[PDB]
Every structure is written in C-alpha cells, then in structure tokens.
C-alpha cells in the first residue's frame, strides 16, 4: 500500500517543477508568451514530465514483476498447502506440516 | 522638543532561550492538514534571545532609569515583549538616525498608529511622557519627546492601533517579526494572554502577517519607544513609575532555516520543525512526518 | 472484450473575468515623458502601484528604436495583472543601449546598470538627438568607468571616491592611476548615430502571487458557479468549476493550495467570497464489444463517474450505457468490474454480478 | 511529435493492471465449488469459529480475516 | 520584420512570415532606382488594422 | 510473439517521429543544411532516437 502510494505521491509532485521552464504552470505560460517563446518552454515542460511518467512506469513494471512471484508463490502454497499436505520442509510451516 | 536623561551607565547583558518561538506565515496562500518545508529567514529554535527591562533599578540609592539600548538589524528581527500597562509605544528603524539618511517611526497612541518615514533628527532619548487626566483618566494622554525635526517624509500610515489597551498580574506577551527585503518591510505579529510565566512561554503561536509597507528604504539598525510615567522634573524616590520595570521585552535574530510547518484542517499553523537544529529534526524533515519510527 | 478507446473530458461554458475593480490610470506621461531623465549612474527609478495600465498605447507609437520584452510577449501585456510594476529610466548612446538585456556584459551592463539574468519586464529605448544634445556639448550625463568590482542586478551606489589603479593609493587625490570615476560624454546634434543620445525606459514586472495592483483594461463578468467555465482571476487564468468554500482565508491569505502545484481555490477581488476550484470532470472511456465476427453492437463504460455527467446502469466502475442489466448470475464473459462483466446473449449486451461456482453441501 | 511514447505508457499500465486481477484469479479460484460447513459445527472438539464466516455480520468474513480488514490502512 | 518569430508594424500588417518559414529573404539598396529628387511617394505603407 | 513483434513494430515506426527537428529524414536536414544547423536539429534527432 505504502509504496504505491508514495509512487504516485511523486509523480504528482513532478508536476511542480519548472525543468528549466520560466514556470511550471502551462497556463501561465501560455498567458504570457507568444507562440514561438511559449512553444520553447512548454517543450522544456514535455521533456521533464514524460520522464517523470517513464521512470514511474518502469518502476511499476519492475514492482509488478516482483507481485507476480509472490503471487505465483501464492497459488503455488494454496495447492500444496491447502490443497493438499506437503513434505516439502518449511514450505508451509515450521515443523511437519498438518494443514 | 526631547529631554536628555541620564547616562545609559552600559548595562551588561543577559540573554533568555527562545522556546519554539518567532513561527510566521510565510506565504499568503491557504493550506491545510498538510506538513509544509519552506525556506525563509526564521528565528532558529532555542537561541539565545537578549532581554531588556522597562525599568531597571541598579544603583543602591534607587535609581529608576529607562533601559533602550540600540540593537542592529540583520536580516530582520523577532521583537517580543511581556507587559500590562503598556509601556511600550513603537519603534525606530534606519541606519545612521539623523538628519542625513531618512528613518521609519512606528508609534502607537490611545486613538490610533502613526507610521512615518523621513529623516528624523532623533536624540539620544526618544520616549512618550504619559500623564492621566484629574477627572475620567479612562484613557492615556500622551507628549512625545522622540524627535527635534522631521523634513521630507514621503510616507504616512494610520491604522488600528498595534497595541492594546492593558488597563494584577494581567502581563500579556506581545511577538513581532520585522523583514526588510525587496524594499519591503513586512511585519508579523500576534498576542497572548499569559499567566503566571515571566519569562517566555514555551509553546507555539504563530505570527499572522501584520502589514507590508513598500518603503524601499535602507535598515541595519533600530530602537525601541517607552512611555515615561514618573516626572524628569522630581523623579521621585520609588513606586512613582512601573513598579522599577516589571515589564520587559526580548529581542532575537532571523536566520536564513528551512522549516516544516504543519496545518491543521483550520488552517492554522500549530507545530514546526527546525530542520537543521539537531540530527531528530532533521530525520523529521527527511521523513516529513512529526513522528519517527525505530 | 473492453478497450480504453477515448477518455471524456466534459468542456467549459461562457468565460469568465473577474479583474478588480479599479478604475483608475497609469501614470504614463510623469514618468515615461518627463521633462528630466537623469544618467545612468543615478537612474530614475518610479514605484507604480493601485493603477489600470493599458500597454496598448505604449507599445503601439512607432516610435521608438527598440522594445524588447523579456519573460512576457508586449501583445499579451493586457491581460495581465501584476502586483507591482518598476520604472527605471536613463539616457545612454545607442552602442550600449545592446547592454540593457539580461545577460549582457560591458561598461555600463556591469558598471552603471545592471539588469537580472531573471529579467521579467520590458525595455523601451528611443532617441533623443533632439532633446538632450548640445551645439556646445552636453556633459551633465555621468557614466562609471572603473569600479572595485561588477554590479550585482539592481545596485545604485552613488560614490565619488577616485579609485587607484596604480601601486599606491592617492587617497583621494587626482595623481597618477587615480582617475575620476565619472566620465562624462559630449552629446551633439552631429554626434553619429551611435554617440546620439536615447533615451531608455525599463519597466521591470513584480509577477508575486500578491494583490495585483497594477492591471491590464480588462472587464469582470460576473461570477458564474456550480459550472465549468474558463476562469481569469486577476491575470491568473484557468479551466474549472467554483463552489461555495467553507475555507477560512485570513484577510492576508489570497490563493488556496492544499495539492501545492494547482490553486484549488481562490478569493474574488470584486466580492472577497472565496470559492473553491474543482476541475469539470474527466475519466477512461472504455468500449465493450463482442468480435465484429459476430456482432456491430457495443456498449459503453464511462468509469468512476455517476450517470449524471453523461439502458443505463451505475456501476462501482462507473456508468455503463447500451447493456440491460440481469438478475442471473453467470461465469464472467467480458470483465467490467467490482464483481460485474458484461456478455452477449440472445441478441443483446447484458450485465451481471459474475458467478463463483456452482454452491455445493458436503 | 515524440510519437508513440504515451499510448506504449497506456499499454504497460493497462497490462499490469490485467496482470493483478490474473494473480487473484490464480491464487483464490482454486476451486470448481462453493462449498458450505455443516449447520452443526460438531468436528470432533476441533473448533475452526475464528477462521470460518461470521454470519451475524455484514459482509461474511471470519473474525480473523475482519481483524486483518481492520489493521490494513 | 521580414523574420520569422517577430511581431511589428510590417509583421503584423502587411507582410507576415509564418514561424515555420522555409525560404530566403534578400534584401538591396534601391535608392538609385526608386528614390526621386522631388520626393518618391509611389509605395504604400500601411498603419492601421483591426 | 504478438509481443514482440508489436514492440519491434514500435521501435520501428518511432524513426518516423520528429522530436522536434524540421524533419525525421536525417538525409534530408544533412542536404538541406549546413552544419551549425544540422548539427541541432540532428542532436534533437539523436535524443528522440536513443
Ligand atoms: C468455539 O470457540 C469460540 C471462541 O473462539 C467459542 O465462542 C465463545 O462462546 C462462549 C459461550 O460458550 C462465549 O462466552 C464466548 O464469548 C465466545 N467467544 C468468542 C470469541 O466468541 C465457541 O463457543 C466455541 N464453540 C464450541 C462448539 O465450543
Ligand atoms: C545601508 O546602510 C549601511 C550603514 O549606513 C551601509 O553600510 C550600507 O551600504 C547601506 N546599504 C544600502 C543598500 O544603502
Ligand atoms: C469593487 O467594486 C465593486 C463594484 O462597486 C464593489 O461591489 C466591491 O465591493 C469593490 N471592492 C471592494 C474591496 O470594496
Ligand atoms: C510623450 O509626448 C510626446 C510629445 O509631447 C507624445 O507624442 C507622446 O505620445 C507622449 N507619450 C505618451 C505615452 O503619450
Ligand atoms: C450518484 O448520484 C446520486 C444522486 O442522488 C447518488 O444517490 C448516488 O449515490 C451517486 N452514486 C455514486 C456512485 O456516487
Ligand atoms: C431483479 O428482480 C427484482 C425482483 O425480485 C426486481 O425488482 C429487479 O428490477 C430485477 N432486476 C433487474 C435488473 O431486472
């Protein structure tokens, strides 16, 4: 829950930097400049937040990654464990495993 | 036209631990049950804040003399003060002074403030001789001595007045923050009511923005004002002023800290963490959280 | 199966400005055409507060050499609002007049002005041949040629102290490598172009988040709520829904920011209510379908929004248009979520809580 | 004109989100029957109260799965 | 003014380049053949739009 | 397979993406330009590419 959390508390945190931008605002941006200038900056802006936004899908492909072996572990000691009774030492518990 | 009194006798100094003290609203925007880090000059955590009476009876025959010391002014200044008469009436901030370079006067009267800025020639003893009136004495006259002349002012405030009416032990703690940046003089301010502690409370109350004047004018040094109520004619053996000085105010220095500062849902500033104070803050600031797990 | 196809992005209606209410004028003919502009080693610097600023007339004259904005485009300086604005003005030859931008070095950029490499403002310069020169030579105009060190962005220090360039001070004496700092200039009406004389104005823009003082001609509309509109609270422009707020904002408090990056509410200068600012609404859109092998038909999920902001079913993810939701509960076809998918049955899209299994009693 | 950056980014969400109700399916529907305890909970002296539904209560669940709800924030 | 990227009296009233312009833009003296002893009033300028 | 392919179609079709340049034909920007200027626009190239 926790790590999540602070992965999209970060990512939404990226929106306030300027990434050398006179602003981090779009909106500002736009009311303030022309075309040619507001184009300069707004790609500066584009730069910085879609790599905010791949570095926290990266993240969230390795994460996942690691969620799926647990829960492939998961069903793997659903089967073996409730499913049925195992002799495979500490796989379910600590002793000789009942149920 | 002011009154010489007599010498300042050099007073050596003492100094008192400010307790989580000097925390102002640093931005004029709304926040709430959030833990914010701001970068502001703020009055560090538990420094030693210098502390001067009203009055101050040294020598053994009784003397009962006024005790304004002049203090620099770096990078703006915490102004506290412990009172219930009102003995203090306002402040002089500027560099020389004189008639050379102009000054900014804050005084604060029974009806109202006054709030000028221009080259006051002030002497060496700036005060408020105060008398009552022989039928209602509801209320305080007033004969200020703080300046000889005053020539090309080019500002003019008046608004209600910064200090309260405090007319036995009814002491009430009175917290300023004075910035000078960007020509701006920003005062914060706040009150407290206070029982029985002398010296300062420890506790927290943040310093509401006060005012903002654009006056573009240049400050390393300031003073502070006081109400004379014995007689420069027959000063007189004891008891004829304010009880030799019970009253007294403290005076700390910003610094340039990074704080955390936690909103409530009303929006009121009620905790802070002094980051750079000791290695537990700055674990609370790295976490941002007021509370650390092993 | 279900596709993300589109993402709904509900629009604003009927704009609305809400700049305050001052009705008063710049001072545009005290400063900018004043009868004395002093030199550059002492510029005259005007504070402009509390007045409505119409750049347009300005900015549209034709006369003038350069205009050059930096930070901001001089068309949009109308729609504007800023808390306070700058006026420093000068007199310099038009050689140096390139030394006035951010990041410019040279005699005057380092010695007698010096604007910030954060420049938000603009410059205005035009010349003043037939003003400031003299048939006999006009040397009131006083620059600095040598200094102890550069100037930092906005230092006025007016010295005269004579500075030794040799081996040993003169302690103030005019001697040998002791020159007189301030140089002056000999201004003529045959003076070449690039010794003639221009005068130059800077208005340098104090872009705070504080009560703009200072503002473009715009009018306020008047305030609309419980609506998505495009909002311009004094310059600050945006797209959202205002609601009544409950907020209390301290008579010094302005902008309201619990997300820190976007200003969640705000106080009308017109009327100091506060209202808060809520985006209009926005969310997936996703397309359920059987194969085009079998069927044209589909259906059509707008997720986490109630059937209000769009055969229509509320679902936990949202509002589901184009299935008829069942009673019987079946092995899931389609997933559409919280516990309900989506099939094709004769012949129509149907919606149903998904069943686990068959019960059965040991 | 970065492309197809934003719709990649949208295909890697959408499939790691498909990917976490796979792992529910895969670790809970581990069975073809909704099966049911007996009315009378008579096992022998073994008592299983504490991981079996609680009917006398919304949304069935064992007093340990609800403590394990409850301290879960 | 003949620039791309540029706002002014000839770029936003008579001749406006666009800011993806492609081309070139040549310019040359021509006072030994336009200007006139008695004043060359026969090219237009124009101030005013909406 | 429908993976792979599908990310080697990407990889493929992002050479058509300008990130900016004038153009996502290098050959084109080396013929129509000199070097101080081909060398931007091929640098914004380079980064989009990487
Ligand atoms: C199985 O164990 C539960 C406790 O886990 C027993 O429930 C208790 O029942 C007694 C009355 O017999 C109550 O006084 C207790 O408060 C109950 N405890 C709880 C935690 O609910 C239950 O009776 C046991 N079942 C059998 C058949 O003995
Ligand atoms: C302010 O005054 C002090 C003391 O008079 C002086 O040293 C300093 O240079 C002054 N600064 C400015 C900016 O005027
Ligand atoms: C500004 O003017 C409007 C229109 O008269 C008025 O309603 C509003 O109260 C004024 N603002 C203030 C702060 O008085
Ligand atoms: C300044 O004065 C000149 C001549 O008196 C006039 O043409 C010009 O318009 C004035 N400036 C403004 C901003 O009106
Ligand atoms: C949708 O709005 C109705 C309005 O009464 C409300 O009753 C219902 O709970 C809302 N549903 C959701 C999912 O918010
Ligand atoms: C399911 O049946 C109930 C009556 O048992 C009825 O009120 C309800 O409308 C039915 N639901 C649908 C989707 O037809």
């Not at chain 2, 008192?16 to 914010?36: A, I, M």
């Not at chain 2, 750079?276 to 007021?290: G, H, I, V, Y």
């Not at chain 3, 301030?182 to 172009?193: A, E, I």
Request: hydrophobic content about 35%; charged content about 15%; some cysteine.
């Amino acid at each position: 829950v926790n790590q999540n959390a602070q992965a999209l508390n970060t990512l939404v945190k990226q929106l306030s930097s300027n990434f050398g931008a006179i602003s981090s605002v779009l909106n500002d941006i736009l009311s303030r400049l022309d075309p040619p200038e507001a184009e300069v900056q707004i790609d500066r802006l584009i730069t910085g937040r879609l790599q905010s936004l791949q570095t926290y899908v990266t993240q969230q492909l390795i994460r996942a990654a690691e969620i799926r072996a647990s829960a492939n572990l998961a069903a793997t000691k659903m089967s073996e464990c409730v499913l049925g009774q195992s002799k495979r030492v500490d796989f379910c518990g600590k002793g000789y495993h009942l149920m | 036209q002011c009154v010489n009194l007599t010498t300042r006798t050099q007073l050596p100094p003492a100094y008192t631990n400010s307790f989580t003290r000097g925390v102002y609203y640093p931005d004029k925007v709304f926040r709430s049950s959030v833990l914010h880090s701001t970068q502001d000059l703020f009055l560090p955590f538990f420094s030693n804040v210098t502390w001067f009476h009203a009055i101050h009876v040294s020598g053994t025959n009784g003397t009962k003399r006024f005790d304004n010391p002049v203090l620099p002014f770096n990078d703006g200044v915490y102004f506290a003060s412990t009172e219930k008469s009102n003995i203090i009436r306002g402040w002089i901030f500027g560099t020389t002074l004189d008639s050379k370079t102009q000054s900014l006067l804050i005084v604060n009267n029974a009806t109202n403030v006054v709030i000028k800025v221009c080259e006051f020639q002030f002497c060496n003893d700036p005060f408020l001789g105060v008398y009552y009136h022989k039928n209602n004495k509801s209320w305080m006259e007033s004969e200020f001595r703080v300046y000889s002349s005053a020539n090309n002012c080019t500002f003019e405030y008046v608004s209600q007045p910064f200090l309260m009416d405090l007319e036995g032990n009814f002491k009430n703690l009175r917290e300023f923050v004075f910035k000078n940046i960007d020509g701006y003089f920003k005062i914060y301010s706040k009150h407290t009511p206070i029982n029985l502690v002398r010296d300062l409370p420890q506790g927290f109350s943040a310093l509401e923005p006060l005012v903002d004047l654009p006056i573009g004018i240049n400050i390393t040094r300031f003073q502070t004002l006081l109400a004379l109520h014995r007689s420069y004619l027959t000063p007189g053996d004891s008891s004829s002023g304010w009880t030799a000085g019970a009253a007294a105010y403290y005076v700390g220095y910003l610094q340039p800290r990074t704080f955390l500062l936690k909103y409530n849902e009303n929006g009121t500033i009620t905790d802070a963490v002094d980051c750079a104070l000791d290695p537990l803050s700055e674990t609370k600031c790295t976490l941002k959280s007021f509370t650390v797990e092993k | 199966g279900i596709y993300q196809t589109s993402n709904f992005r509900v629009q604003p209606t009927e704009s609305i400005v809400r700049f305050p209410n001052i009705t008063n004028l710049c001072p545009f003919g005290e400063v900018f055409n004043a009868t004395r502009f002093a030199s550059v080693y002492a510029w005259n610097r005007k504070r402009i507060s509390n007045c409505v600023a119409d750049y347009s007339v300005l900015y549209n004259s034709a006369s003038f050499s350069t205009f050059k904005c930096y930070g901001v485009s001089p068309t949009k300086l109308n729609d504007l609002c800023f808390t306070n604005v700058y006026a420093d003005s000068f007199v310099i030859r038009g050689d140096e007049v390139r030394q006035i931008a951010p990041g410019q070095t040279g005699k005057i950029a380092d010695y007698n002005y010096k604007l910030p490499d954060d420049f938000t403002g603009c410059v205005i310069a035009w010349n003043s041949n037939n003003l400031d020169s003299k048939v006999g030579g006009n040397y009131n105009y006083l620059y600095r040629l040598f200094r102890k060190s550069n100037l930092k962005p906005f230092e006025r220090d007016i010295s005269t102290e004579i500075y030794q360039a040799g081996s040993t001070p003169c302690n103030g004496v005019e001697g040998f490598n002791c020159y007189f700092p301030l140089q002056s200039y000999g201004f003529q009406p045959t003076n070449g172009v690039g010794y003639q004389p221009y005068r130059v104005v800077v208005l340098s823009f104090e872009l705070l988040h504080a009560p703009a003082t200072v503002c473009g001609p715009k009018k306020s509309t008047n305030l609309v709520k419980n609506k998505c509109v495009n909002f311009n609270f004094n310059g600050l422009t945006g797209t959202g829904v205002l609601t009544e707020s409950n907020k209390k904002f301290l008579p010094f408090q302005q902008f309201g920011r619990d997300i820190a990056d976007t200003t969640d509410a705000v106080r009308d200068p017109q009327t100091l209510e506060i209202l808060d600012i809520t985006p209009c609404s926005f969310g997936g859109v996703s397309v359920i379908t059987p194969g085009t092998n079998t069927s044209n038909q589909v259906a059509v999920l707008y997720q986490g929004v109630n059937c209000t902001e769009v055969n229509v079913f509320q679902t936990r993810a949202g509002c589901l248009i184009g299935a008829e939701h069942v009673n019987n509960s079946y092995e899931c076809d389609i997933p559409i979520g919280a516990g309900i998918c989506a099939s094709y049955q004769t012949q129509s899209i149907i919606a149903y809580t998904m069943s686990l299994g068959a019960e059965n009693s040991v | 004109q970065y492309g197809s950056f934003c719709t990649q980014l949208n295909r890697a969400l959408t499939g790691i989100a498909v990917e976490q109700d796979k792992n529910t399916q895969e670790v809970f529907a581990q069975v073809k029957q909704i099966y049911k305890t007996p009315p009378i909970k008579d096992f022998g002296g073994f008592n299983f109260s504490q991981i079996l539904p609680d009917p006398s209560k919304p949304s069935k669940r064992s007093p340990i799965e609800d403590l394990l709800f409850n301290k879960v924030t």
